[PDB]
């Protein structure tokens, strides 16, 4: 399948070169997979989600996304126009308040929630969790991400936006999950992207158009935007049967575009997520 005039990041993930604008992908499109977006919520009524999104858990007075961040990330995972895996099922877990903040204890509870809640959902092709959040190093936060991964969920986490080594941030620094840095449309490391040996992969993160609250759209930047590209890619590849939740991060690294990014510090992987789809 071909989506013309796609957001640059979608085009990038199906291309061996920057500078194109059509996204190419297998029509299975993540059907039968599920992606949890652990964030500020999801505006599931947005026409872009086509009834495939729902809130399953909140720790606050509402499950609605009063911020936009979680809706944007969910849109990059699986919206019809802005999403990588256009037929996946999206499940929102609201661990962040409408200012975008959340206590580590709530975030940990949300991860353990997903590890159990997947057993209440129909995801025959597999389960992914996208975590566009983080703070300073916490062994308890890393352990929660490790449990979620161990339970059979492909966990993708943001590297962070400090232009610093991600070893000092959580859950970015957990070795067993997929830690995602950000790139721009010219294949440069995004100016804010964290780096370091703990990164597994880069995805599009600068000037990413996606869904927003109030039935709208907007373009924003962050490792928060790169992470759902990788989460959606995992769901898509799992639906194709090419990999599993336990092996998808490694498979994405195996099959990435290699050596094409600029300003990658010595010792950080130079790997850009790529679907290897041959139309």
Swiss-Prot record:
Keywords of this entry: Calcium, Disulfide bond, Hydrolase, Metal-binding, Protease, Serine protease, Signal, Zymogen
Catalyzed reaction equations: Hydrolysis of keratin, and of other proteins with subtilisin-like specificity. Hydrolyzes peptide amides
A GO CC annotation recorded here is: extracellular region
State the active site: 39, 69, 224
- Peptidase S8 domain: residues covered: 7-279
Stated EC number for the protein is 3.4.21.64
User: Which GO terms fall under molecular function for this chain's record?
Assistant: metal ion binding; serine-type endopeptidase activity
Query: Which residues are involved in binding Ca(2+) 1?
Result: 175, 177, 200
Which positions in this protein are listed as binding Ca(2+) 2? 16, 260
Gene Ontology BP terms:
proteolysis
Which cysteines are disulphide-bonded? 34-123, 178-249
Q: How is the cofactor bound?
A: Binds 2 calcium ions per subunit.
Q: Which cofactor does it need?
A: Ca(2+)
Which family would the database say this protein is a member of? Belongs to the peptidase S8 family.
Role noted for this protein: Hydrolyzes keratin at aromatic and hydrophobic residues.
Q: What is this protein called?
A: Proteinase K
Protein source organism: Parengyodontium album
Q: Fragment boundaries within the full protein? A: 106 to 384 of 384
């Amino acid at each position: 399948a071909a989506q013309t005039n796609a957001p640059w990041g979608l085009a990038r993930i199906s291309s061996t070169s920057p500078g194109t604008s059509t996204y190419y992908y297998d029509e299975s499109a993540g059907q039968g997979s599920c992606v949890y977006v652990i964030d500020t919520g999801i505006e599931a009524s947005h026409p872009e989600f086509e009834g495939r999104a729902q809130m399953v858990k909140t720790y606050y007075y509402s499950s609605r996304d009063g911020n936009g961040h979680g809706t944007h990330c969910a849109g990059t995972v699986g919206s019809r126009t802005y999403g990588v895996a256009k037929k996946t099922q999206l499940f929102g877990v609201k661990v962040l308040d409408d200012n975008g903040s959340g206590q580590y204890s709530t975030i940990i509870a949300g991860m353990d929630f997903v590890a159990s809640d997947k057993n209440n959902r129909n995801c025959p092709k597999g389960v992914v969790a996208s975590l566009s959040l983080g703070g300073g190093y916490s062994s308890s936060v890393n352990s929660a991400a490790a449990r979620l991964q161990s339970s059979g969920v492909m966990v993708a986490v943001a590297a962070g936006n400090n232009n610093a080594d991600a070893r000092n941030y959580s859950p970015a620094s957990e070795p067993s999950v997929c830690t995602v840095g950000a790139s721009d449309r010219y294949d440069r490391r995004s100016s804010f992207s964290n780096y370091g040996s703990v990164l597994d992969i880069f995805g599009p993160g600068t000037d990413i158009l996606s869904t927003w609250i109030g039935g709208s759209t907007r373009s924003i930047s962050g490792t928060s935007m790169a992470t759902p590209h990788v989460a959606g890619l995992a769901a898509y590849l799992m639906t194709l049967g090419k990999t599993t939740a336990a092996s998808a991060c490694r498979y994405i690294a195996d099959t990435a575009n290699k050596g094409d990014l600029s300003n990658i510090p010595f010792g950080t992987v130079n790997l850009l997520a790529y679907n290897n789809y041959q139309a």
